[PDB]
Amino acid sequence: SATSFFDFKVPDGADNEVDLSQYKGKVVLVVNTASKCGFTYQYKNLESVYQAIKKEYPDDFVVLGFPCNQFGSQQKVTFPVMGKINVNGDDAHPLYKWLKKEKPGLLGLERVKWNFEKFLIGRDGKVIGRWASTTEPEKIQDKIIEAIKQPAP
């Protein structure tokens, strides 16, 4: 809908508002992280893909983690981790309402199923990829690097 990812604003951890246009023209991987601890091997893998591509392409690529408490039933990272948000429901942060419409999940299902679904933002700000929690960040790596070799508009 002619909107671009870099049109959005989000809260960082300190509940201060971050403007996503500060990342304009970069490749962004958006991931909803667990509010609760105990997912060390997925933080490790996302920290690992982020160190890798940081070496090859410094400043080309940012990972934004967004904590989410919505996936629980009744591990150090260096990429920016943001304020806590809802990814689902009518209360979902406007950013995630856009991400979900722009790139529906499997069979068109728009809801995020679990923690650690990933969206890939190209330099132009369109969603170029969505991967389930079961996909390993290392399989996005070649899609990231293709987004990086692409010029911004």
Add this chain to the structure above:
Amino acid sequence: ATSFFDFKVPDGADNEVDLSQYKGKVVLVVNTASKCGFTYQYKNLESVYQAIKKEYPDDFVVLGFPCNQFGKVTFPVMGKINVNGDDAHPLYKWLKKEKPGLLGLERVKWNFEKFLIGRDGKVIGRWASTTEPEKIQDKIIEAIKQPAP
């Protein structure tokens, strides 16, 4: 003791399958849809299977049992069986009374109810069709770190 691993079941070609061939492994049992057009649940399950499969290759088996009583993956799919009634396969008669449903109700209510078997062959968990496979990974990986009897 009667263990999950004592049972035989029919495979797709209705050959005898002995569950003993999986003895000492962690097994998730899911009654699958008969008719076509339930693709969300198959791909979702396969997706959790390929995951655990890469973390712990060979520890974890998903077993799908088609069932017509209600209304492409890599894990084994078995012969068609009845899950409820007097006509239920012995394995589901067993699984049901071992791990009853929400308020003691033992029948399977819809497609894709999931039973988790520990390395000791006893049922450690039961989830209905409303629960996502991604929510089960915790209890599967916990059972995999557990040693067999």
